[PDB]
Design a protein around this ligand. Structure first.
Ligand SMILES: OCc1ccccc1
Length: 202
């Protein structure tokens, strides 16, 4: 259970300096969505920001020194207005998440079954620890109420990255220092993603 039931509630209870909404609109069909950025699911801000070099981006980040877990709103409740706008303005959505787990793993779900499977094959071929989640899996992200699915098509890819995988991409795994300690494994991962996104959406 989240602390807040929707964005309006979070906005009314939290100081505006303790979170940040960040957008980049390029007209790309694909939107990169990271609604649990900053300290909420560490590393998702950095992956989103790197992909935003080629793709439109929506980012919601928790900016507290601690206690960012209170800022987590599950995808089916996440209704921040700038996210509703940007998702509706795009054809397809890739949404980035983190979950708790020491082993390195990436779970790939979403409503776009064909492209999710293709992504998992490309990740595995490239040497990353990706599994395809199917429709009855809990991290599947297939609800129409899921922010990632409120696009022009309803087709999403949901990328859920374990703590271990996320910690592997940074010299120093802190709010302050991830963005300035991205390592060779960070760029290798984001390269596989850029390669995939350019090919899979034409
Ligand atoms: O310069 C960032 C970037 C890397 C890979 C592919 C596209 C863009």
């Amino acid at each position: 259970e989240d602390v807040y039931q929707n964005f309006e509630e979070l906005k009314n209870n939290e100081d505006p300096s303790d979170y940040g909404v960040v957008t980049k609109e390029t007209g790309s069909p694909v939107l990169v969505l990271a609604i649990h950025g900053g300290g909420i699911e560490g590393g998702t801000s950095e992956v989103a920001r790197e992909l935003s070099k080629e793709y439109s981006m929506y980012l919601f980040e928790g900016l507290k020194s601690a206690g960012n877990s209170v800022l987590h709103i599950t995808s089916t409740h996440f209704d921040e207005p700038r996210a509703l706008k940007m998702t509706g303005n795009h054809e397809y959505v890739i949404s980035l998440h983190g979950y708790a787990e020491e082993d390195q793993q990436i779970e790939v779900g979403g409503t776009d079954r064909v492209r999710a499977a293709d992504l998992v094959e490309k990740l595995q071929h490239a040497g990353f620890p990706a599994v395809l989640l199917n429709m009855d899996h809990p991290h599947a992200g297939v609800s129409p109420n899921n922010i990632a699915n409120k696009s022009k098509t309803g087709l999403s890819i949901q990328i859920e990255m374990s703590t271990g995988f996320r910690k592997s991409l940074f010299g120093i795994f802190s709010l302050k220092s991830r963005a300035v300690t991205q390592n060779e494994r960070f760029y290798e991962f984001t390269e596989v993603m850029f390669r995939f996104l350019k090919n899979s959406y034409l």
